[PDB]
Scaffold this motif. Structure first.
Motif, mmCIF file in Angstrom:
data_model
loop_
_atom_site.group_PDB
_atom_site.id
_atom_site.type_symbol
_atom_site.label_atom_id
_atom_site.label_comp_id
_atom_site.label_asym_id
_atom_site.label_seq_id
_atom_site.Cartn_x
_atom_site.Cartn_y
_atom_site.Cartn_z
ATOM 1 N N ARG A 149 0.844 -1.196 0.000
ATOM 2 C CA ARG A 149 0.000 0.000 0.000
ATOM 3 C C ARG A 149 0.878 1.244 0.000
ATOM 4 N N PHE A 150 1.905 1.248 0.853
ATOM 5 C CA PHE A 150 2.794 2.393 0.998
ATOM 6 C C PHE A 150 3.423 2.783 -0.343
ATOM 7 N N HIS A 151 4.044 1.825 -1.060
ATOM 8 C CA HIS A 151 4.694 2.114 -2.337
ATOM 9 C C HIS A 151 3.666 2.664 -3.336
ATOM 10 N N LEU A 152 2.592 1.921 -3.618
ATOM 11 C CA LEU A 152 1.678 2.296 -4.689
ATOM 12 C C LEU A 152 0.899 3.564 -4.363
ATOM 13 N N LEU A 153 0.565 3.816 -3.095
ATOM 14 C CA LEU A 153 -0.089 5.056 -2.683
ATOM 15 C C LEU A 153 0.834 6.269 -2.832
ATOM 16 N N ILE A 154 2.113 6.184 -2.389
ATOM 17 C CA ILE A 154 3.029 7.313 -2.556
ATOM 18 C C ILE A 154 3.319 7.554 -4.038
ATOM 19 N N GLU A 155 3.316 6.474 -4.842
ATOM 20 C CA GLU A 155 3.618 6.560 -6.255
ATOM 21 C C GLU A 155 2.450 7.139 -7.031
ATOM 22 N N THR A 156 1.232 6.603 -6.846
ATOM 23 C CA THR A 156 0.050 7.082 -7.570
ATOM 24 C C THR A 156 -0.343 8.502 -7.151
ATOM 25 N N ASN A 157 0.048 8.948 -5.946
ATOM 26 C CA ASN A 157 -0.174 10.322 -5.515
ATOM 27 C C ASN A 157 0.998 11.251 -5.831
ATOM 28 N N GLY A 158 1.984 10.863 -6.664
ATOM 29 C CA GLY A 158 3.044 11.754 -7.105
ATOM 30 C C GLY A 158 3.977 12.264 -6.002
ATOM 31 N N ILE A 159 4.214 11.473 -4.942
ATOM 32 C CA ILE A 159 5.187 11.801 -3.906
ATOM 33 C C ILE A 159 6.572 11.342 -4.376
ATOM 34 N N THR A 160 6.614 10.186 -5.044
ATOM 35 C CA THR A 160 7.799 9.671 -5.714
ATOM 36 C C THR A 160 7.661 9.963 -7.208
ATOM 37 N N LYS A 161 8.802 9.963 -7.907
ATOM 38 C CA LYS A 161 8.901 10.286 -9.324
ATOM 39 C C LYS A 161 9.846 9.254 -9.934
ATOM 40 N N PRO A 162 9.387 8.004 -10.229
ATOM 41 C CA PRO A 162 10.248 6.995 -10.846
ATOM 42 C C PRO A 162 10.723 7.377 -12.253
ATOM 43 N N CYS A 163 12.016 7.111 -12.505
ATOM 44 C CA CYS A 163 12.646 7.226 -13.804
ATOM 45 C C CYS A 163 13.265 5.876 -14.139
ATOM 46 N N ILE A 164 12.903 5.287 -15.295
ATOM 47 C CA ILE A 164 13.497 4.044 -15.782
ATOM 48 C C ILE A 164 14.521 4.388 -16.865
ATOM 49 N N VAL A 165 15.761 3.876 -16.717
ATOM 50 C CA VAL A 165 16.781 3.997 -17.747
ATOM 51 C C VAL A 165 17.198 2.581 -18.166
ATOM 52 N N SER A 166 16.981 2.282 -19.465
ATOM 53 C CA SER A 166 17.495 1.109 -20.152
ATOM 54 C C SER A 166 18.820 1.467 -20.833
ATOM 55 N N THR A 167 19.397 0.481 -21.556
ATOM 56 C CA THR A 167 20.540 0.700 -22.445
ATOM 57 C C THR A 167 20.217 1.671 -23.590
ATOM 58 N N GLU A 168 18.935 1.781 -24.009
ATOM 59 C CA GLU A 168 18.520 2.545 -25.180
ATOM 60 C C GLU A 168 17.649 3.769 -24.878
#
Ligand SMILES: CCC1=C(C)C(=O)N/C1=C\c1[nH]c(/C=C2N=C(/C=C3\NC(=O)C([C@@H](O)CC/C=C(\C)CC/C=C(/C)CCC=C(C)C)=C3C)C(CO)=C\2CCC(=O)O)c(CCC(=O)O)c1C
Ligand SMILES: CCC1=C(C)C(=O)N/C1=C\c1[nH]c(/C=C2N=C(/C=C3\NC(=O)C([C@@H](O)CC/C=C(\C)CC/C=C(\C)CCC=C(C)C)=C3C)C(CO)=C\2CCC(=O)O)c(CCC(=O)O)c1C
Ligand SMILES: CC1=C[C@H](O)CC(C)(C)[C@H]1/C=C/C(C)=C/C=C/C(C)=C/C=C/C=C(C)/C=C/C=C(C)/C=C/C1=C(C)C[C@H](O)CC1(C)C
Ligand SMILES: CC1=C[C@H](O)CC(C)(C)[C@H]1/C=C/C(C)=C/C=C/C(C)=C/C=C/C=C(C)/C=C/C=C(C)/C=C/C1=C(C)C[C@H](O)CC1(C)C
Ligand SMILES: CCCCCCCCCCCC(=O)OC[C@H](COP(=O)(O)OCC[N+](C)(C)C)OC(=O)CCCCCCCCCCC
Ligand SMILES: CCCCCCCCCCCC(=O)OC[C@H](COP(=O)(O)OCC[N+](C)(C)C)OC(=O)CCCCCCCCCCC
Ligand SMILES: CCCCCCCCCCCC(=O)OC[C@H](COP(=O)(O)OCC[N+](C)(C)C)OC(=O)CCCCCCCCCCC
Ligand SMILES: CCCCCCCCCCCC(=O)OC[C@H](COP(=O)(O)OCC[N+](C)(C)C)OC(=O)CCCCCCCCCCC
Lengths: 106, 169, 67, 168, 67, 107
Positions: free
Chosen positions: D16-35
């Motif tokens: 709950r903690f992860h998805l609630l902070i994430e869906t409410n824009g408290i965290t800002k995930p950035c994914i970096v691949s090789t490309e």
């Protein structure tokens, strides 16, 4: 791993008026949050102040947190529309929720 | 489809607290109309409300601790409700409310005992809506004149009586 | 200070409102409940599962705007 | 059918903690691949990486307090990551991990400072998953060898640098 | 002296699993992401929006049984 | 309407082992919850003891609350998730099932 000692005192009470079955509340939490290491020789003390209001039926909501070792504060507010006798029927006020969050560091 | 509630979203009419306790079976709502009892076990029991009180909920052997009664007085908004919480009697009618045989100003919200944080009853009215709650029994109810919702805590399971019946277990 | 602010408005979607004005589940049953003798003389909508579900679904603030 | 997270239901994989902070824009995930860099502002920015370390996140004019860099090496599990939290450098590779230079037993728990509850970095590995968090910066990251997720707190809005870009 | 006990088992529904095996949104896009050169060689699924949403939807324990 | 005073102390801390990024915790809360009436003082005092365990990544969770009023009231809530694997995006963490229990005893 870290150990915690959190002393706190909560004061507050009900707000007069409105629907006393869902009576409004205000709350004040004061306390000290201490983290210790495994030895307990590195110690982090944080003063904690929390102020909560929720009016009758949770219509108007406020959560304020101040943390001090330096300083970190947050004010969160959430305002719902005024109710009518029939919860099942659409048209309570403007059918809108207004929220605000402010965070100040330093 | 009540448990298709998503508490991630703010709701303009409902609390997280209410719908989460309800969808997790902590509360057991019973609706009584003039014609039917809608049980918390999902049965419609036809019962024509008359001038005599019928027991809709109450603790087995202990109606003084908790009991709830419905009658009809006829006309518009005809339902009369009696809620007994720890020896304190609330009567609701379309014209307002009384506590142990004295009428009270229910539109300004009323607590008995007025001084006791462990109150037997609180009651409040707006238009034709009446809400009621007991800190002693944890029974909530609300009332329109046409129907009453009596909601018992699940902690009554195995001691529930009245037309609302079993608390699901 | 370094001081950052988020405003949020929660609203009901058009889709939810369109659904509540139609006759599909649970709004059809609710409309049928409104014509029953046990409910029709009240200002309040039927205390039925149909009308209650429909109420919860319609009052969910699915439209979120940040400013 | 349903497309939103419902925290009323238990989830077997997520808190709950992860998805609630994430869906409410408290965290800002950035994914970096090789490309590609997948920004928290909802943009796919192509970058086919050298073995030059490239700035993906960091504080504007305090890169010692927080900065994040990505390298490509070659072969399978080719992604290499550098995370700086309060002047403590974490380096992640397919082979394991190091703090400031010194390689550490990341398949157990590792924390630096080891005694400090306000730790600069914690890091843990199971199979090819690496997780990392800093209590000082509140930057979370995790790493597969193929990509890294770098998650910044929304409190960095107006101070955000690197290819992950705006926080909005 | 009086006790209430509720056992509760949460499971994933068949419908959720059927959906995850099909090609509709987001499981189709996830399958497309799994052939892209940045993802295809790894043991892990793509770190994409499509696969992530798909993962969350599927792992929600929507089937509840009480005993 | 009513006034509240709640004094409490939380002790305990992180459990060794496992994923220390999401390190397990064991916490004890002890305190006293006092409700006072407005008009003078009728006063209700409730002793509070809370025990929380949550293992690394919240895999295994326990919440126990004992109230003594001045009668007794307790609750044990438990919630057990499957053992994880490296890829959160891939289905098949154990049996993909949640095991929960709730027990309430009123004395
Ligand atoms: C069948 C459903 C239904 C239909 C068909 C219908 O027409 N209405 C229905 C239900 C309904 N129900 C509604 C509302 C409310 N229901 C309740 C019910 C309860 N609240 C409670 O807290 C309880 C308790 O019994 C819960 C359990 C508690 C205990 C056993 C003891 C507590 C005390 C102690 C000492 C232990 C404490 C321990 C801790 C760990 C904390 C019930 C039954 C309420 C009141 O909250 C409402 C009002 C709205 C709201 O609250 O949001 C509302 C909203 C009404 C409106 O706004 O007009 C509706 C619509
Ligand atoms: C775009 C999203 C995404 C894609 C496309 C993808 O493939 N993966 C994605 C995200 C994702 N993200 C994931 C996980 C986690 N993300 C976080 C992130 C955070 N947790 C936090 O707490 C924070 C903080 O920055 C939050 C904000 C905090 C502050 C501003 C407070 C600062 C501190 C103060 C004032 C108090 C300090 C104390 C004093 C006493 C003074 C982030 C960024 C986490 C870790 O929680 C995970 C792991 C999973 C979990 O938690 O469940 C996971 C699961 C990983 C797994 O299990 O394998 C996934 C899948
Ligand atoms: C019952 C009773 C009885 C008797 O009679 C008396 C008494 C005792 C008094 C009572 C009690 C009570 C209580 C306990 C209470 C509680 C409360 C709370 C906790 C609150 C909260 C409260 C809370 C709150 C407000 C909160 C909120 C929040 C918010 C807004 C948020 C925001 C946001 C935004 C914008 C967006 C971004 O991106 C992010 C976020 C961050 C997400
Ligand atoms: C952050 C940090 C950091 C550093 O490093 C360190 C430290 C300080 C330690 C940390 C902290 C921490 C914390 C505070 C935590 C918390 C927790 C919690 C609160 C939990 C709960 C928890 C909780 C829980 C278990 C709960 C659960 C529940 C349940 C099961 C339920 C059940 C049920 C059932 C069956 C059925 C019915 O019908 C009803 C119900 C009732 C619904
Ligand atoms: C900071 C969080 C990070 C991420 C998630 C948070 C985002 C905001 C969501 C929370 C909103 C909030 O706290 O608002 C304010 C909330 C209530 O609002 P409500 O339940 O919507 O009822 C609104 C109801 N109306 C529409 C009729 C007006 O007041 C309160 O709690 C006060 C007392 C209740 C305690 C809450 C317990 C809830 C469940 C308990 C388990 C059975
Ligand atoms: C979300 C984080 C905190 C919890 C949020 C709660 C939502 C607020 C409103 C509903 C609360 C409720 O129902 O129980 C709160 C309880 C009892 O309820 P009540 O007085 O019968 O209900 C009246 C209001 N009604 C009509 C809305 C239901 O209060 C009490 O004094 C009970 C005495 C016990 C003391 C509690 C000590 C435990 C502390 C635990 C610290 C870890
Ligand atoms: C600032 C705080 C606000 C932000 C949100 C944080 C709240 C919870 C965090 C406590 C940390 C902890 O120790 O939790 C302990 C656990 C967290 O379990 P879980 O989240 O399912 O994680 C499991 C993660 N797996 C799957 C990776 C293993 O709880 C529980 O067993 C009880 C959950 C009760 C569910 C009842 C419904 C209410 C839902 C809420 C609707 C909004
Ligand atoms: C429900 C609405 C209200 C607010 C919603 C919360 C949103 C969450 C935002 C950040 C989450 C977070 O972590 O908060 C702050 C910290 C967490 O810091 P961390 O150690 O970096 O852990 C990160 C997570 N890991 C370890 C899994 C990676 O927690 C704390 O206890 C901080 C301790 C000091 C303050 C304690 C006083 C609190 C009083 C509470 C009275 C109600």
């Amino acid at each position: 791993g870290s150990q915690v000692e959190f002393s706190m005192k909560m004061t507050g009470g009900e707000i007069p008026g409105g629907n006393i079955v869902l009576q409004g509340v205000k709350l004040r939490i004061v306390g000290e949050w201490v983290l210790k290491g495994s030895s307990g020789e590195s110690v982090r003390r944080t003063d904690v102040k929390v102020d909560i209001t929720s009016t009758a039926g949770n219509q108007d909501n406020s959560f304020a947190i101040q943390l001090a070792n330096t300083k970190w504060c947050a004010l969160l507010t959430k305002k719902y529309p005024e109710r009518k006798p029939d919860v099942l029927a659409f048209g309570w006020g403007n059918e809108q929720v207004d929220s605000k969050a402010s965070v100040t560091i330093g | 489809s009540v448990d298709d509630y998503n508490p991630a979203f703010d709701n303009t009419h409902y609390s997280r607290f209410h719908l989460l306790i309800e969808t997790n079976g902590i509360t057991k709502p019973c609706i009584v109309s003039t014609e039917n009892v809608y049980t918390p076990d999902n049965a419609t029991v036809p019962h024509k409300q008359g001038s005599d009180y019928v027991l809709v909920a109450g603790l087995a052997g202990d109606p003084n601790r908790f009991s709830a009664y419905t009658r009809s007085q006829g006309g518009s908004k005809p339902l009369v409700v009696k809620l007994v919480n720890d020896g304190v009697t609330l009567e609701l009618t379309r014209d307002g409310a009384s506590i142990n045989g004295k009428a009270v100003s229910v539109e300004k919200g009323v607590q008995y005992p007025q001084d006791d944080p462990n109150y037997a009853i609180r009651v409040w009215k707006s238009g034709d809506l009446v809400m009621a709650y007991s800190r002693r029994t944890a029974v909530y109810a609300y009332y329109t004149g046409t129907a009453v919702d009596v909601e018992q805590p699940v902690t009554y399971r195995g001691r529930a009586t009245g037309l609302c019946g079993n608390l699901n277990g | 200070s370094v001081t950052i602010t988020i405003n949020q408005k929660g609203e009901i979607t058009e889709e939810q409102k369109q659904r509540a004005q139609g006759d599909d589940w649970p709004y059809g049953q609710c409309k049928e409940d409104q014509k029953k003798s046990e409910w029709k003389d009240s200002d309040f909508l039927p205390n039925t599962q149909a009308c209650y579900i429909g109420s919860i679904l319609l009052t969910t603030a699915r439209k979120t705007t940040y400013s």
